Design a protein around this ligand. Sequence first.
Ligand SMILES: CC(C)(COP(=O)(O)OP(=O)(O)OC[C@H]1O[C@@H](n2cnc3c(N)ncnc32)[C@H](O)[C@@H]1OP(=O)(O)O)[C@@H](O)C(=O)NCCC(=O)NCCS
Ligand SMILES: C#CCOP(=O)(O)OC[C@H]1O[C@@H](n2cnc3c(N)ncnc32)[C@H](O)[C@@H]1O
Ligand SMILES: C#CCOP(=O)(O)OC[C@H]1O[C@@H](n2cnc3c(N)ncnc32)[C@H](O)[C@@H]1O
Ligand SMILES: C#CCOP(=O)(O)OC[C@H]1O[C@@H](n2cnc3c(N)ncnc32)[C@H](O)[C@@H]1O
Ligand SMILES: [Cl-]
Ligand SMILES: [Cl-]
Lengths: 582, 604, 666
Amino acid sequence: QTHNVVHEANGVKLRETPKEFFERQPNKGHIHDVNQYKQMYEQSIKDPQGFFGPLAKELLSWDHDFHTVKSGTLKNGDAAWFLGGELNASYNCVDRHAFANPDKPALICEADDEKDSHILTYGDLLREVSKVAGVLQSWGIKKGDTVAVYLPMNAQAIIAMLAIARLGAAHSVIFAGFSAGSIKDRVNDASCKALITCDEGKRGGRTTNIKKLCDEALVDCPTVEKVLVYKRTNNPEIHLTEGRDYYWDVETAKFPGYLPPVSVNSEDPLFLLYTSGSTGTPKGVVHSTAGYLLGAALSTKYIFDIHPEDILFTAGDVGWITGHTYALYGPLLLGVPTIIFEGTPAYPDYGRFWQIVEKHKATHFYVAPTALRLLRKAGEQEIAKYDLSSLRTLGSVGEPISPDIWEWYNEFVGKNQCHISDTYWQTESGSHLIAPLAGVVPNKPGSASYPFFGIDAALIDPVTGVEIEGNDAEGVLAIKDHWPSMARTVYKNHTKYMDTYMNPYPGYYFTGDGAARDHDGYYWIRGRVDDVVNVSGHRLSTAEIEAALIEDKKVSEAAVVGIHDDITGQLVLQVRKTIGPF
Amino acid sequence: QTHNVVHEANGVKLRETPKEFFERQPNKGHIHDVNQYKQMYEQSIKDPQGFFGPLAKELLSWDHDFHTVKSGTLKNGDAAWFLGGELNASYNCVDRHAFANPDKPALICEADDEKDSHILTYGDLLREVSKVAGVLQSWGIKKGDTVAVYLPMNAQAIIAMLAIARLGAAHSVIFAGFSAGSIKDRVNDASCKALITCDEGKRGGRTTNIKKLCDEALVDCPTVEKVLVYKRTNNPEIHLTEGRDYYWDVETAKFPGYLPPVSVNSEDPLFLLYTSTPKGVVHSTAGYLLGAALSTKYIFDIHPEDILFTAGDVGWITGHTYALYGPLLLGVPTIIFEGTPAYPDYGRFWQIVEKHKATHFYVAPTALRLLRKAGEQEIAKYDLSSLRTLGSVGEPISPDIWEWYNEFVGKNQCHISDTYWQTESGSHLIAPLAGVVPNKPGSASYPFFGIDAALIDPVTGVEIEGNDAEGVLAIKDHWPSMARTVYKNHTKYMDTYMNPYPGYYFTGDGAARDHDGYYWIRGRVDDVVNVSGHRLSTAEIEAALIEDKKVSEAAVVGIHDDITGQAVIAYVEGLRKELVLQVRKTIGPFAAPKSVILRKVSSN
Amino acid sequence: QTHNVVHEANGVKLRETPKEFFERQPNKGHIHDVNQYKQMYEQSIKDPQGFFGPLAKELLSWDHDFHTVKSGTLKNGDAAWFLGGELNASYNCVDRHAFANPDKPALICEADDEKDSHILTYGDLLREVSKVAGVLQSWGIKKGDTVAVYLPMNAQAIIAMLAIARLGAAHSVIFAGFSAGSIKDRVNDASCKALITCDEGKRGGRTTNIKKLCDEALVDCPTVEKVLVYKRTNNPEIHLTEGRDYYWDVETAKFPGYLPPVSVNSEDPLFLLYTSGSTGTPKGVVHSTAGYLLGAALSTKYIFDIHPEDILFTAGDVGWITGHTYALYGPLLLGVPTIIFEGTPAYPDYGRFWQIVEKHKATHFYVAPTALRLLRKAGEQEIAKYDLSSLRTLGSVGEPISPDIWEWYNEFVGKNQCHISDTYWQTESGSHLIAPLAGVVPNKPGSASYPFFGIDAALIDPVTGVEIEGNDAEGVLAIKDHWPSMARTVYKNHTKYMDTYMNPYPGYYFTGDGAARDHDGYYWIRGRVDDVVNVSGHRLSTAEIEAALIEDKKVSEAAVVGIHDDITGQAVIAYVALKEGNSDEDSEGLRKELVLQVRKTIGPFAAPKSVIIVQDLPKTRSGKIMRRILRKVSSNEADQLGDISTLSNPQSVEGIISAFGAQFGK
Ligand SMILES: CC(C)(COP(=O)(O)OP(=O)(O)OC[C@H]1O[C@@H](n2cnc3c(N)ncnc32)[C@H](O)[C@@H]1OP(=O)(O)O)[C@@H](O)C(=O)NCCC(=O)NCCS
Ligand SMILES: C#CCOP(=O)(O)OC[C@H]1O[C@@H](n2cnc3c(N)ncnc32)[C@H](O)[C@@H]1O
Ligand SMILES: C#CCOP(=O)(O)OC[C@H]1O[C@@H](n2cnc3c(N)ncnc32)[C@H](O)[C@@H]1O
Ligand SMILES: C#CCOP(=O)(O)OC[C@H]1O[C@@H](n2cnc3c(N)ncnc32)[C@H](O)[C@@H]1O
Ligand SMILES: [Cl-]
Ligand SMILES: [Cl-]
């Protein structure tokens, strides 16, 4: 019972799901109890074909059937799922819900300033996506092209991603905080034919330089033929380069409210997302179409317990994977509304999150612990002014959640009435790897709990490289077989992909994290083993900041390390200009 | 019984279909009587899914099934039919019939001079279409491209259109009578990658300059990469530009008689057709084809044994729908007439009908008036007893012309189908079904399947219930063959058809409905601007302004406005307010212009 | 019983399949008896829809079903099969078998030197094909493009072909024996966007220049954007042109081991294979996808009696049609291992074929009679060193097999215990046309026997142009309807296709061969009627050789003809007249020069057996050369020239005769 290795586990009482969770859920839970979950998990590991085939058919709409559920091995880095099938991401995210119920809300958009907020129905979303896709189609964008998006977290970002997917092209989303150099790097690696951006952004009430950073970068991006610019502020003084830049409203007005979607293969790339890595310049993680979408829908449904009546508020940015999977694809695939928040938790005050939750009766809230630390320090008193009784599932993402914050999250936001899901995963996994299912798995504060369907977690001894049998163990966290939403390569550098994930421990997937497993099987994430730092949920490379500093001629040598920080979890102008303010 | 509004209907006896019609039709009619037609029509309006789904499966061959029969609304201009389905126009018009009976005639071509007439079987058509598609494919034409056609009404025009559709590209057919300026405008708006044409044309025994006008246009058409030139006259003096112009016979000889067709989406554009600044009406693939086949079958009573002679030009919608797509989809021969009704003499139409024993004849009243004036004696010289359905298209047919048509051509033995429709509708909207609907001469009669016809008051925009009424002719829901957009100007599409009377399709015509429900087309309306629900006449404002002695002349136009829908701009601070007050007291308070080629400058 | 026309058939005892064949056969045979074969054949002729439709569904994996089994006619040149259907060639050859059993051997690669041999499983092949296709995809290769392959007979050539097909593009394979000019001709006609090759080759233990010949040709191939070079010898001295040439290993390392295959239409072109004809320029025969693959699978399965347990050794090169169909597509479609031999039958000794068979326990062996003649002359002693008891089907391809060689093949290789399948067919047929099915059809040595499924064979009278009813006949060999794997066109020259195959005998396919049919219906191939030479199984154009000789400025005129050869079947004799040279000292000096001219223009294998220097070539009143005179003289039929008064230069004939006598053997 007492753990000599897993010190986190000693004397920690299991936390059962509160009664209010089950009272508030609109329908019967998808899994009755933890024992049914283990039966389903055991099948998803021993019999992936008989487990994932039927779910793929239930949760996704197929234009062509698949003939093989699963192919490939980690060691050969040739994993593939639902081979021979064809589908379209935007059809599954928009069309089929629009045909069923066109007036159902899809994008609940909360602007930096609430006066500018608006809601798009699934019918509205189909017309806007079709028109932007029509613009891209007129420009020669076609299956196989890549299109960059440089937009803040608002409706137009979702529409751009979905419009690119409609044509069979792959979107490459670039966080609005990146510098012109970071834009240049990503656009050139992917050889994007087109870019979608806006004139300016609004964050915390302050104007943001968007188009200007694009122009500075594009002088070195010869592959970009055309740019679509949305008028977020409609500032007249913002310059558009003639013959290359065109206005969103002007061009979409030229095209009809329906455009047929384009079928792609299960294993055609849905998108590229450039993550910072221990070695080298940022690398474009590639995700397939079928496997990624299934992983997104499946995890959204089962870990968060999402039903059609529910509303999900993921306080993330599509510049990162959390927005991709659980702000856009996960919820829309399931046909529920998703809340897209452009602003910050502090503007106009530290009750903004709670105003939104009360306003739209959100049932699920998904945020990074860094925000919880901020609200604990500055905004605790406002929580009580807003009605949060609509929530039943509260999620944590992107970094460890200390047991103290877990309790703060549970009581002050959850009112000790909600289920807390500490979701462990990474950009390369596509979706959740270890997380406690809402309404099924009791919680240990700070523990990611059991691994998800199709995730065969294991601990390896770093020095011997041998998998660690038995519980009460510590080691590098690895997976013993690939899973549907696993990233398939790094764009045009599959060798980097193999050397990073598959080759260090042959037969395994290397998460880059160390973890611990206790006698109950709960996993405790102990953090990166490599030189990758996590600052406020943002993944950074110590090499990239060291490179930015050395770029300055005055610098002889540079060395970067990470330390504990109570607000953010973990020459200055040179690093801001090389990488980004964050 | 007496009409107080629809004066045309007073004292008009219904004219039953003659017995010789049913004696001559090869099989039992597709609809038994007017009551069965009413049942089918009510379903096509109340239950479009359960009506059109089965017909789409019966009449068309699908490469991929559709999952939704009908989508969209007029007001959002996002109409779509048979979503998720894939098919090919040339496969449904050529391939499937060629496999069934390759020797059945497909294109009965009558040349300007009969010596050059010839017949192509469906097998022949498949080979010629395959070869032209092979030429275009080797040239890089692919799905998404547009290809212009500048050809007279002959086999090569049909072959080009089907070959372009075979690859998934959209053909944009340009009437051979158009000038170089008209060619340039259309080619550049569609950004065509290739052009198919001929060296010279023959009309009325006279040579027409075709390639020369193309060359004149292409100096300003940089998107045109290659031209395919047919040797219609084989004139040695006609020059071909090296590296751009290639001969039809030379290139088609290089490629085989089969080329796989390329599947497209139901809602992929089949073709662009520029209305007579010119705007490119776009038609979908599945919806347009179903409308063409369905109307041809039921309005005209077409069976596999029949032969159709549509005396129209593929430069216009009538040729597209009822000279090519309609009849070929159903697998019947179609007569493609290159020349004029007068050359070599004014009996040419009737010689053709006699020669090929055509059962169906479709012509415009303009031609009927000409032949009445100059060739009436010639009709009796020929055997026309093979005809049973006589169609009128494109303009009103007066009761006198209707009677002349019925007696001198029909011998009082045929059914007459006065077909009302437009380029944007793709196919028939109001027309009397052959053998089913008794007609009133000068009346198109009942609206067709999927066409929910209505009359709206021009001032209020409110639908006029009840019969013995007059108003703007509108449609209450979209239909499969309805045009989907104006090429790269969907705003003009909405402003023209969907915005003037929201929730309706605006035909631009006025009509009247009598106590029996028959519609009487009264012709184009004044096309009144709509500013925030107040409908205004630009002509009335020009007149009110001209009444002012200070005004030299006045010209008023309408443009799109983001707040009020349409805006009125007047071309002619004390005099501007004096003119605005002149318009308010002459016309009305809500008729004052927003401000005082003219449309494009106003729209910037 | 006695034949009055078909003398080959007189006094020829039928040879039943040995009993050992069925003992060695792993399962029940695919065909019950010859009567079942006759019934199936009749249905394949009278009811092609009900016969081939079901077989196409059994043997191929379809991405879209077909709606019409068969379309078009020979006379119109618009043949088509399985219309509306979609599939992918590399999926049916690799993916589907890899998913079933990833570890099963697929490519048994035997290198020029056995130390370098290796085996690729179907899983290995899927990853390698996926990676090469990934490189081509990154380079912009897409459905509709053509890609040239210039590689020896080894794994990388197979991988290249399958990777190109995976993307929906058509491969055009160029035999490694071709010179730079022949590469240039083929690459430019097809307008290939990319080329796949290697640095150097190994044959008979000697290094061959491969990339060097590509570089020479590519200076005049402006359509080629990028080249993929495999490191066969990894010789550092081989130069790669910057911006165009990239190494196979470096680029494939950038892309993953799975790439989704691209659906193509049944009638989208699978490949171009440039054949020589009676033209003087090679013509690119085009093959469809569905029909060709079905033909490959069907003939491999039924003519050779291939089961999943079997191992096929086709001793051919993918540079030619035999390698395409029966070294790559046939066996891989059926999911069995296939042996890819890079070297020669003689290196390191004349037992190499048999070493390979014994090493891998091959069950089927497929070779050209030219090789049999070589091993009979030089390597007969080697046979006894090897265990050949794993073989049961022995095939002959590409040229007539004399009854003596048929017996030699039967005794020393087969041990009088195997079935022998003399397969008649050609590049344009895609697959076997007339062949005795293994375990079903009794053999007459030297006879291809009965026509195969879907092949309605006929003999036409050379004089009347009328089909010959009844047996004991001879005439032009023609086919009365098209068949699935028939070539569909000549690339961008459909007129040459029609004039060559479909127009000469309207309503028929013209094989270019003459044949005879005996009282039993067995067909006896009597050889080309269109003056097309076959040297050691290589199809050559005498016109193309004349052109190469004329390129030499010393040459005034050239006339090339074919004669019988005891080693190579047919040999090429070149008669040359020189502009300004009657010098007898130059004699052999310029004869070698001319031979080298042919070697550098076309390739070493096209080199003439002999060059005859003459003062004048015999010509007509119009001035055309009379090649019949040269044929008869070279065949030692000097008599049988007949009246030569019709020549403008009858006196030239005597000089030709004496020139041949004085120069042929020396
Ligand atoms: C017995 C046989 C193997 C003789 O092979 P060989 O010993 O190479 O003799 P060849 O007659 O081919 O030699 C002629 C020239 O071609 C060259 N050659 C033949 N194949 C070659 C190849 N793949 N790569 C390079 N050169 C080649 C030889 O090197 C030789 O050049 P050389 O005069 O400098 O020596 C003969 O049967 C053969 O060439 N095989 C082809 C049979 C066949 O399958 N035909 C295709 C039917 S579709
Ligand atoms: C998600 C996401 C965005 O993906 P990414 O930006 O790749 O960051 C992922 C990395 O963040 C850390 N992390 C993420 N979730 C947890 C967790 N529940 N408990 C402890 N650590 C966590 C790990 O180090 C991951 O590798
Ligand atoms: C058709 C066609 C070509 O289409 P289009 O060239 O657009 O012309 C269409 C216009 O012609 C007039 N019209 C057409 N048919 C009739 C008819 N039966 N009775 C009275 N008027 C008719 C109307 O004004 C239409 O809008
Ligand atoms: C195959 C192949 C090579 O293909 P290809 O290069 O097209 O040459 C085709 C010519 O080969 C000769 N041939 C082929 N097989 C036989 C045989 N079994 N018996 C007699 N002659 C045969 C004929 O002359 C063919 O027309
Ligand atoms: Cl206009
Ligand atoms: Cl005013």
